[PDB]
Amino acid sequence: MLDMPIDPVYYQLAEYFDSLPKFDQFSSAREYREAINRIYEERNRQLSQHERVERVEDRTIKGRNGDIRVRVYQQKPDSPVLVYYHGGGFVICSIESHDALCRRIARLSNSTVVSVDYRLAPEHKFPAAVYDCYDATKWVAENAEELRIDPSKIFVGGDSAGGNLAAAVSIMARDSGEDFIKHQILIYPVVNFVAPTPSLLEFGEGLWILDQKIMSWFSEQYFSREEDKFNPLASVIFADLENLPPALIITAEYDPLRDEGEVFGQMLRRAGVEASIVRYRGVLHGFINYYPVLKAARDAINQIAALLVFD
Template sequence: MPLDEQAATILRGLNENFPRVETMTGAEARAATKAGRKAAVDPESVGSVQDREIPGAAGPIAVRIYAPATQSAEPLPVVVFFHGGGFVICDLDSHDGFCRAMCNGIGAVVVSVDYRLAPEAQWPAAADDAYAATCWVARHAGELGADPDRLLVAGDSSGGNLAAVAALMARDRSTPSVVGQLLMYPVIEPVFDTESYEEFAEGHFLTRSAMQWYWDQYLPTHRDGAPAYAAPVRAEDLGGLPPAIVITAERDPLRYEGEKYAAALADAGVPVHCRRVEGMFHGFLTIDAMTAAQTERRELWPRLRALAAVRARN
């Protein structure tokens, strides 16, 4: 399906202005993307926003906690969110708009996690931080006004990988209870010759060469035998994982692997809603100004509310 006029304009700007990260160091790529980021003039209002640090496996982890303005007599659902950026770039600010929208859209506390970035901190640093943050949120949900039995994990791109891995770790270690996972065009495994990689290797914002570089920063060795906590589709057993919403974009080199993981979850008996958004490119859902993103969010929020309505069975 062709891009609509607005999407084509935005994609053209991304293709022309987003830095070629594969020509840079990790620090240079972070600096370049931050320099090109425009601060939100009037961010969506929520009830409260709090920046704090929580303990992690290798030191403090910065988080940003969003609470909706709507009052509830009952504790709210809570979403642990992991931002995208190829395990190398982006931060709490880059995904602030999406977290605000999700907080209001599903009426949940959202905890956005500033996990350690590669290449300074390679795998399993980000995965360990993701799991540590998920455990902390479960233990401290009460003080956040949230229900630990209605905890979800969510993320986009590399953050989708970390959400999937956090859910896998929680199942394997029997704690905490996770009732749902939202994986938005997730990074799943270091394979670069899939159908969607061949079709959209260039010209659609995220490129094959950029993804190869991101994986080189995050997992420079053991790529052929990437472990499940780096490439979750390679887990021996996916049974018993929480229900998943998987969103892919038609014009995204990662489309195939996201849909492959959704199919693998379904084959293992995990309830899955997999939706391919036609005519869209990688990253569109977190672009607040995009009409297609707003349309898709209106479709997504009720599905997330339904996941969050089911309490964990302890």
């Protein structure tokens, strides 16, 4: 139990969550990563069977940091695109662990999704991932014809650390005077590594998926220096927000990062950026990947897909 009115699916998933490998059960992030990604990826292999996509292509592109692999899920050519950045605290997860999710988005929308295989920490410290995501996004904008995507409909989005990366990318594009991003989709993002919030304290302990201990561990792996936490490409909540793309922010009710995400949405509104802040009740951080058994996740996904389909 956490606060009380939690979707009954979580109580049914008690064994599952408790059986997952914990970060502090290994001596290094690498070993932890290998153990947890193995589980996530196998599950995705099962789910993808039910998310058919006309074509899924793995391409290697040139980022300032070197090679960057991206996976292009294209259900239909000459369609809108969502450049996506997977979650995982900047340390774990991969294209394969969010494969089912991206397939479903591309399939439902009859469009395109480009999932970025960005450099992970601690191997590559902040801001390596931010630059990989920005480089891949710009590459999508610059290769519109080759990829067969609509250059006038390019969206960016991600979940958790991925939502943070989508926000950072949007800022980096704005700072560079680039205007190709038409929408940013932040799924329960982390946008602050310096200040506390009531939700951070309230759910700092006691919930599955995320607690204060692993959050501190993630930032320790991500940043090479403490003060990097205040960088505007990290704690995006302190960046200049003028002219940023219109945003759809999806938050989870039982999540330490909840208030942060909502405050970031209110700050964007003040700065004159249009934004929607949607809090899903009864769910925890990371809920979107559980769409096969959680309706709230299927509806959250429908919101992302609707953006690529509707005008």
